[model samples]
Target: LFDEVVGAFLKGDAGKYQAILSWVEEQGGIQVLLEKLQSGGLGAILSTWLSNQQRNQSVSGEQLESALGTNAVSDLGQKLGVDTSTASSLLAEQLPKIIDALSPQGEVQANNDLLSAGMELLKGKLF
Candidate 1:
């Protein structure tokens, strides 16, 4: 889901990237989002959203921990058709931006109106 959103931003012009990036900063930057994900705050929100969408599983902290590990980084590279190192760098750069925009604090009314709509669109397409 996040990879796809990054793809969306990358496929678009500069405005799209800035739009999402600004939202990230508003959510307290990339470090804050990484903290939340490792601490389960972001994962819990994701789990609830999945539940609302009728999915039976949870995306817990441990699950996310594994997903952020080296193997998963390699897999993401394969999925994106980039070098593993490039993918790793891109993940470090973009994942936090995407996650920051999607997390709870990131969902300010102004920023989130667009983010929420885009998320709903993505969810519809994804699920």
Candidate 2:
């Protein structure tokens, strides 16, 4: 069961969508990713995302690359067949909305369901 919202959020780029799925899966889930942000001092930004607002606090490619680390971003890039820098930028661009969608209630309890649910959509496009 794929979520149309996830598919639509990537603007029809299945590679990026797949990359996000793999990236989140690699890091555990959105919860851990947010925790990673918290650990990296982006907790305030993460808080902004969860603060019930129309605009999620913007995050930077540099910020995410630093927090998620070169190794992790490299893996994300590797999955997308793109470079690490580009991968981080893409992740930076999409993460907030992704988190927002997954956390409709302003919490991480929605967890991995929406992203994990992307599997069906991924197979439809990538496989």
Candidate 3:
């Protein structure tokens, strides 16, 4: 999944990136993914995805186009060099890392460094 997002970014595909994020938000995919992490644990979920590729295979470019509509997919592709399919796939992989790296902990835990790194990582993409 990381490969897909990276491919989208490397190719300058803002629409695709935005589309993936939007779909994630719309479908509550982000929440679902985060819930899985919080419940099963990030390491376990990631490992499962890796080991069970057939079950957790990434959404294909065609699927993204179908889901989001052709015009959007084409415009996104024309601007991005790739498609939202890859963006959707990679997001499934990275957002969790970003969230965990950013969220503060309970009562007491020196996770400041993680918070800082997470902020910096987001800063590069965010304003």
Candidate 4:
């Protein structure tokens, strides 16, 4: 569901998507990510991104680093073999898109099942 839904926005770049998938999990999965984001001053952007009646806001690399932390973004870049700037760029572009895709019902839902399913799919595809 993750790749099939979120991958549409990513143009089927499986490796990039996988990189993002693992990164999100490392950040403690979708629920943790959102909980942290809302408390970390990106609540407005998060709301906009998940709203049915509002357009998703653009989060810049710098702004994302501020929210997710420089170290987290740097770790993502290391996973993808890229620099922090480039990694944040990808997250800036993909984070909302991924969130938007996963939560089309206007609210973020439970993720353990969905997340594990996506991980299994990746293991099948990438190996």
Q: How high is each candidate's TM-score?
A: 0.35, 0.73, 0.31, 0.75
**For candidate 3, which ten residues in a row score worst on lDDT?**
103-112
Q: Considering TM-score, where higher is better, how would the candidates rank from best to worst?
A: 4, 2, 1, 3
Model 4 poorest ten-residue lDDT run: 109-118
User: Over the stretch 21-68, how does candidate 1's per-residue lDDT look in tens digits?
Assistant: 453455555454455554644565444332433322334324443445
> Which candidate leads the pack in TM-score?
4
Residue-level error in angstroms, candidate 3, position 95: 2.2
Candidate 4, residues 1-127, lDDT tens digits: the string is 7766565566544588878887777777788778868877999999998997789998898888888888989999988767899888999899898887665568862367556655554566688
lDDT of 1 at 49: 35
lDDT of 3 by residue, 1-127 (tens): 8997677567663354455444444444444444444453344433334442223334344443444445544443344455555543445454434444434331111133433454565685686
> Native-vs-model 1 lDDT?
0.48
Q: Which runs of model 3 end up more than 4 angstroms from their true locations?
A: 1-11, 15-17, 36-43, 46-85, 106-127
TM-score of candidate 4 against the unseen true structure: 0.75
Q: How many clashes in each candidate?
A: 0, 0, 2, 0
Error of 1 at 59 (Å): 22
State in Å the error of residue 32, model 2: 1.8
Which candidate would rank higher by lDDT, 1 or 4? 4
Q: How far is candidate 3 from the true structure (C-alpha RMSD, Å)?
A: 11.3
For model 4, name the residue pairs that clash.
Answer: none
Cα deviation of 65, candidate 1, in Å: 10
